[PDB]
Amino acid sequence: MRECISIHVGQAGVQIGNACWELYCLEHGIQPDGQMPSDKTIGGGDDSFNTFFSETGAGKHVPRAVFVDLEPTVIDEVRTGTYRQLFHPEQLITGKEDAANNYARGHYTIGKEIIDLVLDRIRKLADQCTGLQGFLVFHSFGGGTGSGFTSLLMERLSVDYGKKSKLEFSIYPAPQVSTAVVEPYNSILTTHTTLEHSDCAFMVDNEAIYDICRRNLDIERPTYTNLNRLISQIVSSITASLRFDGALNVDLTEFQTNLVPYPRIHFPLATYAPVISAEKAYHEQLSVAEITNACFEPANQMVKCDPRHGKYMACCLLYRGDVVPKDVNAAIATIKTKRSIQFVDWCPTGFKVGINYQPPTVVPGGDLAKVQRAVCMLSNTTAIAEAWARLDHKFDLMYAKRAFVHWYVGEGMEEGEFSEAREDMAALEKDYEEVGV
Amino acid sequence: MYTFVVRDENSSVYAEVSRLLLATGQWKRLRKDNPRFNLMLGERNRLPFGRLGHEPGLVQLVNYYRGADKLCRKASLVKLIKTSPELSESCTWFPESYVIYPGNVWIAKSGILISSEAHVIQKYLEKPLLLEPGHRKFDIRSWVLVDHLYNIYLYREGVLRTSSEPYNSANFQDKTCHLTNHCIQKNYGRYEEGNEMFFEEFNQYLMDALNTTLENSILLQIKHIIRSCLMCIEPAISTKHLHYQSFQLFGFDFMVDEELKVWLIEVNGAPACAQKLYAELCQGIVDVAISSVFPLASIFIKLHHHHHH
Amino acid sequence: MEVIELNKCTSGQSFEVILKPPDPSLEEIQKKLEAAEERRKYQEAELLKHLAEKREHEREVIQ
Amino acid sequence: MREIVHIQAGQCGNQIGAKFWEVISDEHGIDPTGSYHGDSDLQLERINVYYNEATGNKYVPRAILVDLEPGTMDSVRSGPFGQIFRPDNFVFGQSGAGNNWAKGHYTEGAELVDSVLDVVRKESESCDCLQGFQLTHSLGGGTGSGMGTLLISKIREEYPDRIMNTFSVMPSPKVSDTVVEPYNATLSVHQLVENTDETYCIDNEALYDICFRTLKLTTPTYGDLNHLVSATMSGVTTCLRFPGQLNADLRKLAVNMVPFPRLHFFMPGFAPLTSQYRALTVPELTQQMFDSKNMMAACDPRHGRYLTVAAIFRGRMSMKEVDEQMLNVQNKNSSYFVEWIPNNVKTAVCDIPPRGLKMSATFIGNSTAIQELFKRISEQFTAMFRRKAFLHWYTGEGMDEMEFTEAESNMNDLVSEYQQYQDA
Ligand SMILES: CC(C)(C)c1nc[nH]c1/C=c1\[nH]c(=O)/c(=C/c2cccc(C(=O)c3ccc(F)cc3)c2)[nH]c1=O
Ligand SMILES: Nc1nc2c(ncn2[C@@H]2O[C@H](COP(=O)(O)OP(=O)(O)OP(=O)(O)O)[C@@H](O)[C@H]2O)c(=O)[nH]1
Ligand SMILES: Nc1ncnc2c1ncn2[C@@H]1O[C@H](COP(=O)(O)OP(=O)(O)CP(=O)(O)O)[C@@H](O)[C@H]1O
Ligand SMILES: Nc1nc2c(ncn2[C@@H]2O[C@H](COP(=O)(O)OP(=O)(O)O)[C@@H](O)[C@H]2O)c(=O)[nH]1
Ligand SMILES: [Ca+2]
Numbered sequence A: 001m002r003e004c005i006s007i008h009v010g011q012a013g014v015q016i017g018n019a020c021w022e023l024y025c026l027e028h029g030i031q032p033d034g035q036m037p038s039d040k041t042i043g044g045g046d047d048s049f050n051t052f053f054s055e056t057g058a059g060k061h062v063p064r065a066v067f068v069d070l071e072p073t074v075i076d077e078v079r080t081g082t083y084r085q086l087f088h089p090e091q092l093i094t095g096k097e098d099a100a101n102n103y104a105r106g107h108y109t110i111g112k113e114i115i116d117l118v119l120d121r122i123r124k125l126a127d128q129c130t131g132l133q134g135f136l137v138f139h140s141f142g143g144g145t146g147s148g149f150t151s152l153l154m155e156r157l158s159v160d161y162g163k164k165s166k167l168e169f170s171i172y173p174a175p176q177v178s179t180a181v182v183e184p185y186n187s188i189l190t191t192h193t194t195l196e197h198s199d200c201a202f203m204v205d206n207e208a209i210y211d212i213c214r215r216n217l218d219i220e221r222p223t224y225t226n227l228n229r230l231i232s233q234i235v236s237s238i239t240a241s242l243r244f245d246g247a248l249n250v251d252l253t254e255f256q257t258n259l260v261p262y263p264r265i266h267f268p269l270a271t272y273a274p275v276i277s278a279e280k281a282y283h284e285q286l287s288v289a290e291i292t293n294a295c296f297e298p299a300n301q302m303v304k305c306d307p308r309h310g311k312y313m314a315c316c317l318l319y320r321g322d323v324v325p326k327d328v329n330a331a332i333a334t335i336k337t338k339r340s341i342q343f344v345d346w347c348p349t350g351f352k353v354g355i356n357y358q359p360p361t362v363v364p365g366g367d368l369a370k371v372q373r374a375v376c377m378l379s380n381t382t383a384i385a386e387a388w389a390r391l392d393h394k395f396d397l398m399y400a401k402r403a404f405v406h407w408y409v410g411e412g413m414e415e416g417e418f419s420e421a422r423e424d425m426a427a428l429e430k431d432y433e434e435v436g437v
Numbered sequence B: 001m002y003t004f005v006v007r008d009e010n011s012s013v014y015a016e017v018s019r020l021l022l023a024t025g026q027w028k029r030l031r032k033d034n035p036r037f038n039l040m041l042g043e044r045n046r047l048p049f050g051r052l053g054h055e056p057g058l059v060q061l062v063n064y065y066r067g068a069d070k071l072c073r074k075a076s077l078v079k080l081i082k083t084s085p086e087l088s089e090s091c092t093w094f095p096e097s098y099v100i101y102p103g104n105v106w107i108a109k110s111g112i113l114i115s116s117e118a119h120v121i122q123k124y125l126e127k128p129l130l131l132e133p134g135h136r137k138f139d140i141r142s143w144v145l146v147d148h149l150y151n152i153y154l155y156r157e158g159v160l161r162t163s164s165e166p167y168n169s170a171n172f173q174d175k176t177c178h179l180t181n182h183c184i185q186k187n188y189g190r191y192e193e194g195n196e197m198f199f200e201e202f203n204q205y206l207m208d209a210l211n212t213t214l215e216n217s218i219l220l221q222i223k224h225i226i227r228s229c230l231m232c233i234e235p236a237i238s239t240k241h242l243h244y245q246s247f248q249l250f251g252f253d254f255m256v257d258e259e260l261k262v263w264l265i266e267v268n269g270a271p272a273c274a275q276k277l278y279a280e281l282c283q284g285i286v287d288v289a290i291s292s293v294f295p296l297a298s299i300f301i302k303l304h305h306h307h308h309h
Numbered sequence C: 001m002e003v004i005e006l007n008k009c010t011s012g013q014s015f016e017v018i019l020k021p022p023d024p025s026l027e028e029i030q031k032k033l034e035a036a037e038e039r040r041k042y043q044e045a046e047l048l049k050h051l052a053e054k055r056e057h058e059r060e061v062i063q
Numbered sequence D: 001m002r003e004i005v006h007i008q009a010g011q012c013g014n015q016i017g018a019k020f021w022e023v024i025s026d027e028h029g030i031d032p033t034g035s036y037h038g039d040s041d042l043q044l045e046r047i048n049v050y051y052n053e054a055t056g057n058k059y060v061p062r063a064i065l066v067d068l069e070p071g072t073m074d075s076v077r078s079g080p081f082g083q084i085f086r087p088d089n090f091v092f093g094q095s096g097a098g099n100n101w102a103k104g105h106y107t108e109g110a111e112l113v114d115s116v117l118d119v120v121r122k123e124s125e126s127c128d129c130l131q132g133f134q135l136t137h138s139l140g141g142g143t144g145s146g147m148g149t150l151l152i153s154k155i156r157e158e159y160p161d162r163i164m165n166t167f168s169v170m171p172s173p174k175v176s177d178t179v180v181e182p183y184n185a186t187l188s189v190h191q192l193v194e195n196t197d198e199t200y201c202i203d204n205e206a207l208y209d210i211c212f213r214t215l216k217l218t219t220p221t222y223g224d225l226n227h228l229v230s231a232t233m234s235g236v237t238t239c240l241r242f243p244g245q246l247n248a249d250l251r252k253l254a255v256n257m258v259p260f261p262r263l264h265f266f267m268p269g270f271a272p273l274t275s276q277y278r279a280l281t282v283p284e285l286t287q288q289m290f291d292s293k294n295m296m297a298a299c300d301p302r303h304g305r306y307l308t309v310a311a312i313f314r315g316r317m318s319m320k321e322v323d324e325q326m327l328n329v330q331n332k333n334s335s336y337f338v339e340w341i342p343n344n345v346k347t348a349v350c351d352i353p354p355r356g357l358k359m360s361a362t363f364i365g366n367s368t369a370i371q372e373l374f375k376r377i378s379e380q381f382t383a384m385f386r387r388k389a390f391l392h393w394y395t396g397e398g399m400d401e402m403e404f405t406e407a408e409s410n411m412n413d414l415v416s417e418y419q420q421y422q423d424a
């Protein structure tokens, strides 16, 4: 096997880390203290789960995780929480003063005085690896630490670890759960500087997760805890092939090969069905056909957009539960003739299916019901550029007036970096249109 | 108090819809680039469909169906009909057309060329139905409203855009007898006002001259073509379950031949109404398309047919 | 519709179904991190230069 | 970033500043002698923001009390919560400042300023992470106006990276001690444009009208004006003094409220206005806090446009209903919110209500209509200044007519700058 280091930057990154590592623990049967009874090789191993967990002599299973935040209060809840014994204190790095929703403060000002420490703590985990694959980076587009410090990390990770792959789990800003007004700036700035350093990135629009939590879980006003537990299900689905026995998406390089032919266009859409409420008394369990068919409904996507007005370069159906190949092929046969699934000319019109017989694990006292079978479709569709267009339009309105810009410039950043970053995004929108129209 | 924005100043149809909405006291117009609207009366080219349905606490509606251009451009319409199973190459109501990039009479179009020597190249209807007295060609325009639910509403009033010149088989270069467009004519208004024969008169002519009705001889075929065309594209363009909603007014252009067979010529995405009918159609657009989605404090005929087989 | 490269195991299986065929250096980063710190320190200097002039005007009024 | 250092300067500054520590000490369960007698752990969870911990588990406000005469500071110490303040932080001169900016800024206050900064340094030293400073003062008198702005300029020199926020009471002929207030206010406004990150424009005109028209008090005292002020001071400090999953400090809030550095003068507001039995519904709070009648700065928000708005709702209510109502006023009055700052109205809810009210709402508006306030003081200034009237009081303390001409021009520039974004 080959090891994977997960990095959680900023509030959003950290709290999404918590949810994932909680879920990974329940999936592999690892307990809060870190013992795993079903693991028989005590002290080490090269099993599939060892890609994400290291081992000690006492029998503890320790996440290959680094938590980074420019203020302590969120990572303090990890130090005092249910999974406090799980982590070594050196993995949990905190500063004193945050980035105040300012890219420039996170990247340049406060970024500089902590970047060398963080890479050192990352190097302490890489040296425990017999053969490092690379990194899973969790952060928000909207925050100053999430946007700013993440892009500085990704720049350095390319220098220190040039042979390794880097995957992103990005939270794209939604006004309905954000109190920051300057997120459009932060999101474009970090997307510009992270683009050449990120091999494959999974965007999650907080708008889509929020409305899924309203519509499908019957939750009136979804909290971050409601959103994060749902996100971490999608994340787990995506990373299950790295952690379990299988032949699809077995390493980080294969995510790029299967999903990303055109390197700049490395933003695959995630769709996920079924999301069903635990409070629901009567639920008729959904079939392979029904949940595969749900992967092409916009209301289940991680980013709201219309795949019909766009083209695919790659599709991947990752199933969890009672599913067999012929049910999947029969579902795909039905769906091809009903729905509008147009591929690009140079790509084969096809699906890479991955099935794991273990059904999705649900967090005790959570919002999600137990299900017989579920699926996460990962499709590289040009329709996701809809999200860039929205972000770029918001950017253009504010930036035309130079609104808020002085805060960025006052932290050492040059005004030219704004229009420089917007021009990359202007090209990115153009790249998507060439491919998809 | 709902809100709308107007992003098409040329649109003679939605100027009247804008006026009718304002003259109620329950619809305020906003600026062209304000995001906080309920209704977008949008531009023809490059309408930003990606920015719709992302403003929290606002149900958003637009007056264009995205992807409906695949019915309305001539090149795409020909490619749609040949490739879709439910229309097919052997389509009885569409003239034989071919695509080449920039009785054996054809017509070229996208500067219109009608010859045998020589965009799309379409089979020209050599023996059309000719009105009398006049011995002259026409085309029929039918207005079609598809709402947010995909109810296909045909407007009861259509119009025959007539040629005023006698039709000539030998003389092709003379455009005024072959091409029946309103701009190309303006004998402009010899037989009827502005070369526009409405449905009441055209029914009566068919009764007197042919012993049949508009409803039977022609309109049954029009309803079948409209319904077949839109239900074909329903999976591609429908806004059911979608985060924003769409309607659209289409204009269907038809040709009736000597043996009373109806042929589809063109579908139009941004059609204009005839001068008399604006007031009724635009009130119909408000009642059915807008007021169904946004309720305040029948002129159409619904096209539905579920034959079991 | 062809079902290729079917691989099975005890915890799952995978396959493919085809419907139809067809970086700056460590020098430059640490350089431009510091270039922003020069603009940060020049801007704070311009402020303490401006505030120093206020201090001498304060002395001039009382004198 | 947790600790805030509070400074109150002058008669007005010390009066409203005393009321602030009265209101929040009640909210945090701290008695007149400094001991805790609450019930919720939420009352002590972020008590370090405004209080230092002392021996015997006593809580002492991180508060410095400044004045150029003893009078008002003797009244603070005698008053209900006066015993809680650290005696070393009472810093005072003897001769007063006779409602004279020059005395405050250049002569009398210059003699006292350095000993105030020694107490600031003493408080700032034993602060784990100082987030910034907050100041209470009037701009109409001498001490709070002249010395308060002098302190603000000195604090910025020694702490250039910390946030400086002020509650600045604006003078009005309706509540007027002296004819020279416009002079003192104009000189002070130029200081705040340069040296503060946020300034809450409490207009005594507005507080009077709210007491007269919308509360039916015929003869309103300063206590009736200060009652309205303290309700707002509590409201704007709620999200720092409690949780509730809000991860924001003074800088983070400043970054989201101030799109242009000079335009940081806010229009405060409160619902319901008091001097009750029936608790307000969420729709009423929303309509009242956006209503011109409830504005603490006498401007008509319809005469400008909102750059940003912040609203913090207190009490046990539906967050769904808050979202709905806040979205209702924006989408039904979208002309008055600038289209070129998307999603510029942000909201928070706190479960703990203030004393007396079952649910309230505090309004923080950065509107371009605040130019009306600065135009009004500019008109009063020029009425006197064109005849150099009452200038001898200022030239006697060393000032030149040039400094007035500069300050006149600096505030008229601010007005022009607000007009630029109102038409854009
Ligand atoms: C998401 C949400 C709604 C929370 C939000 N999103 C953007 N903003 C907000 C809200 C606030 N934003 C602020 O900038 C703010 C400023 C603040 C804080 C503390 C003190 C003082 C202050 O000047 C003071 C008070 C008493 C005193 F004696 C002297 C001075 C100002 N308070 C807020 O509640
Ligand atoms: N889904 C999700 N989104 C979050 C969470 N926490 C914050 N966000 C979103 O992230 C954006 C704000 O960024 P944060 O991650 O809070 O900021 P940060 O990275 O801590 O950076 P600074 O606050 O600038 O130090 C907003 O869009 C929030 O809605 C979370 O736990 N889950
Ligand atoms: N195959 C055919 N046989 C006979 N007449 C035809 C024809 N194709 C086109 N025409 C005639 O040419 C005229 C105009 O051509 P067409 O309808 O293709 O484009 P157009 O753009 O002018 C219609 P509109 O402007 O209303 O959308 C029609 O009114 C019709 O009478
Ligand atoms: N709202 C309010 N305004 C006050 C109070 N005391 C004084 N003022 C106003 O402040 C100005 C006078 O300044 P003052 O603070 O008395 O002078 P200082 O002691 O020299 O700073 C006038 O405009 C008064 O209207 C008060 O307690 N409340
Ligand atoms: Ca092992």
Ligand SMILES: [Ca+2]
Pocket: D108, D111
């Ligand atoms: Ca003296």
Ligand SMILES: [Mg+2]
Pocket: A010, A011, A071, A098, A099, A143, A145, D247
């Ligand atoms: Mg943060």
Ligand SMILES: [Mg+2]
Pocket: D011, D141, D177
């Ligand atoms: Mg006084």
